[PDB]
Write a protein that binds this ligand. Structure first.
Ligand SMILES: Cc1ncc(COP(=O)(O)O)c(/C=N/[C@H](CCCNC(=N)N)C(=O)O)c1O
Ligand SMILES: Cc1ncc(COP(=O)(O)O)c(/C=N/[C@H](CCCNC(=N)N)C(=O)O)c1O
Lengths: 351, 351
């Protein structure tokens, strides 16, 4: 009863199973056509699916990577020559912090209330070479609103600061489907976006990170990318294209309704308990934070393990101040509903 | 007419076509069995296929990565924690150098004749924390013989040096099919090997790098691997498993015969031209160097392009002295014979 890893483990839909049934046809197509044609079609399907109409479609402005984390490694190393300090949203997915810090960058935490609620201080922006924002954020689900993205982008441009976005959870929240690329190109900061197909669908970790960057980024992303790969499998791009097309023809709506149901299953199952609260009431992400007073997320985690239920304590996400996450756990929602409901039912009895 | 990229673009055999036809069955399998089980089966079939029987089969000793270059990035960044200087075979695939140099390692080139023909000097082993050998080497095809691998491993153990091997081309040459792991364990040096499935078969870049290391490696490979990925798709591991089994069942002998045929087609078209010569007469790799007098490899490439034939100039492999490769191009042999044959007929008239 794994509710820890955020990737999708629910069954395929009928439309998605039909895609999988035609994998030999996609293989034939991948053998027959220029990879670039399929990649263009995959990018267009995925970006247009999620409202990113102004993405740069000239071949080579979007670099297909095996994963978001590969893209992130390329970005961190590309930053490390010219940047000492990154302002990083806190909490966020902890590997972002480990990848930046492992490549020699010093991190400055920016709390969410500060990031979403007001302009960043000039003193901060002038003291960092990059601002890095996960939107929708993991674990909180919080979406950087369009006006805030615009003001942040403008401020980064004013300060010569790179604006980097990790938009991996984009597909789950329509609030994140306004055209980010329009905003960034309009603002004219040096920017980079890491899109990710890998959390949306149960494609057995067949996915791509998509590293997108402004023409003036002034970082060696293209070169270091080239150092790591020539490209991703056309079969995976064809897969992405088809899953995006199925998503465009109602699949995406069905996925939102399914995550909403599982989020509901979780909140109904725990609402009467303690002492329990749900810090992110408006989140539509595929992961869910749960907070409780009295006990520690680590304790709760330890006890759930005894019952073969595996969630995540939240300490790891508060990468600058782990005690900040002492009283919360994270629960994965991209799960078949029956196994998910068993999981939180154990959680309820433990509490 | 692409004869540049090393990856395989020849037609599927009947038996490989049959594996592609079962991709939906392998998908359902991947959904239903623990990834670790499939991974162990994939590893066992690939290592055993190529004679690497003493590979450490305990889970977690073989780290499955999206590609050999991802494995290489992990190794490079791990080395930089405690190593300043790496001795690297020269020429070799230039990403190996660009990844090491880009993670902050200083490179000492070791020409192939030094590496294969004599012990490494005490002066050299006093100055480097790692020796890195690509075997079979790309682009030369040169195979590190068992006697030299043993002696190299003995010297690394004596000095405390890490011995690192890149064995992506292993499957093409039966001279590389003696058990490298037995040699490395016998010597007791710190060692790391990057195996790669992606050059052998036309799998549309569905592949894994396999990062294997001694228990005393004393480098943070497990931590850095974990920061970049959790694992590779079970569908890709299942495919590796099935392609390795088809190869054990005669595929591999047929592939050796196919590559030999195509090498003969190239040499048939060219060995009487000019001024033309073949630097690596004994190579059995899927890539082939051609030398010429008078003109430059870059200039041959430009003329080939005009006729829509894309080969590779060799400068980039001589990563410490590119002018060493000024008079050579590389030709990909993992190609359908007819396109390859058109390609060299064009290259013939050019020369
Ligand atoms: C905002 C964000 N950006 C990037 C990544 C990197 O994903 P990647 O592994 O490279 O495919 C994550 C990962 N989230 C983790 C899944 C861990 C990887 N899952 C997997 N099985 N491949 C989580 O939320 O549990 C993330 O939340
Ligand atoms: C000894 C060696 N170790 C690692 C690599 C990295 O392999 P990877 O691209 O990560 O799957 C190569 C690559 N050889 C290059 C292929 C270029 C990549 N092709 C692709 N389509 N992804 C060649 O010889 O042409 C190599 O020769």
């Amino acid at each position: 009863l794994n509710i820890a890893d955020g990737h999708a483990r629910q069954a395929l839909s009928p439309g998605q199973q039909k895609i999988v049934n035609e994998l030999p046809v996609l293989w034939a197509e991948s053998e027959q056509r220029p990879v670039q044609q399929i990649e263009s079609e995959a990018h267009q399907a995925y970006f247009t699916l999620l409202g990113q109409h102004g993405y740069p479609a000239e071949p080579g402005r979007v670099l297909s990577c095996y994963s978001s984390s590969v893209s992130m490694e390329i970005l961190a190393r590309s930053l490390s020559a010219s940047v000492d300090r990154v302002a990083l949203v806190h909490p966020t997915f902890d590997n972002i912090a480990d990848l930046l810090r492992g490549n020699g960058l010093d991190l400055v935490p920016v709390e969410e209330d500060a990031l979403h609620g007001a302009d960043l201080s000039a003193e901060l922006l002038s003291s960092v070479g990059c601002v890095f924002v996960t939107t929708p954020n993991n674990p909180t689900g919080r979406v950087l609103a369009e006006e805030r993205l615009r003001r942040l982008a403008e401020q980064c441009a004013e300060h010569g600061t790179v604006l980097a976005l990790d938009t991996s959870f984009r597909g789950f929240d329509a609030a994140a489907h306004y055209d980010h690329y329009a905003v960034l190109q309009e603002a004219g900061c040096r920017w980079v976006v890491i899109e990710d197909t890998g959390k949306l669908w149960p494609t057995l970790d067949l996915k791509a990170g998509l590293l997108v960057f402004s023409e003036d980024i002034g970082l060696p992303v293209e070169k270091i990318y080239s150092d790591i790969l020539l490209g991703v499998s056309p079969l995976i791009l064809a897969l992405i294209r088809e899953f995006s097309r199925d998503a465009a023809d109602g699949g995406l709506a069905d996925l939102h309704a399914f995550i909403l149901h599982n989020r509901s299953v979780v909140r109904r199952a725990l609402a009467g308990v303690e002492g329990v609260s749900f810090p992110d009431p408006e989140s539509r992400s595929s992961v869910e934070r749960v907070a409780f007073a009295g006990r520690t997320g680590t304790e709760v985690w330890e006890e759930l393990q005894r019952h073969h239920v595996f969630a995540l304590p939240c300490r790891q996400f508060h990468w600058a101040e782990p005690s900040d996450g002492d009283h919360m756990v994270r629960i994965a929602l991209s799960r078949s509903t029956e196994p998910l409901e068993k999981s939180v039912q154990v959680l309820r009895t433990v509490l």
